[PDB]
């Protein structure tokens, strides 16, 4: 929980019911899966930014006379239990995993 | 079928009179162009923007929940015949190239 | 704070030896030039798209849920000296001189 240039908010969801897949394709999120004979809820650790501007110039900290910035959300894959409705199988989903800043140089 | 994000103008230019240059002095441009025992008139081509909010919320396309934007025009540089008060002289100028896209974050996510 | 939705790259040129005209043919642009008892080199400033696909999607901001678009470089007239093989002549060339995002709608869900 280090003071960044970002502000991010984690959180345990297990009703999650609705992804994007690796290939980018919306899904449905099963909600039990059962293992071997043994059902259990699909759970997701997940991480978003506050907002996009923690400051009014963007991200916090920036020199901003060189730069422009804001804050952004990035994602990592997990396996999931789904369905498009066509089949149903495991698949990578994306997830929020944090709240980064990208720059860009101010035009000169 | 292909849109543009932005819609421009071109346009031939002869009567233009005054310039930023380079160096960013307003400058004026001379009208016909003598050099070399000969009489040319100058002309310019120059692309804007014929609107800078082809829709409603701005540029085409553009995923305005995320995004603010709007059409502007950019810039070239070109040579021309000129004359601060001082002394005629060649100078690059600016002038108008083109119209594209400009995003601007909207301040939520 | 402004951002882009197509990534150009520019520079001056200072060796160009061939172009195409404002008719579409291929001439010759003179290395140097001798106007009024002086000597000079033909500078051009031209701009590019660093690339095609700034982004993943295509071009940067777009609404890629529902479009199609990637970056591309547009181009203006300038005058130059050249040279058809026999007749030197002042000649309006193309240039590149901008980067902008093309649309291509999509058939969705
Ligand atoms: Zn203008
Ligand atoms: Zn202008
Ligand atoms: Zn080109």
Redesign the interface.
Same mark, same amino acid.
């Given at each position: 929980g280090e003071f960044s240039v970002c502000d991010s908010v984690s959180v345990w969801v297990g009703d999650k019911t609705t992804a994007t897949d690796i290939k980018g394709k919306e899904v449905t999120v099963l909600a039990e899966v059962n293992i071997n004979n043994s059902v259990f809820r699909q759970y997701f650790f997940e991480t978003? $930014?506050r /907002? @996009? *501007?923690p400051v009014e110039?963007?991200c916090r900290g920036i020199d901003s006379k060189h730069w *422009? @910035?804001? $804050? =952004? =959300?990035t994602h990592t894959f997990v396996k999931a239990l789904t369905t498009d409705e066509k089949q149903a199988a495991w698949r990578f989903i994306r997830i929020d995993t944090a709240c980064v800043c990208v720059l @860009?140089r101010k /035009?000169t």
């Open positions: 978003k $930014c /907002a @996009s *501007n110039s963007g *422009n @910035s804001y $804050c =952004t =959300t @860009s /035009a």
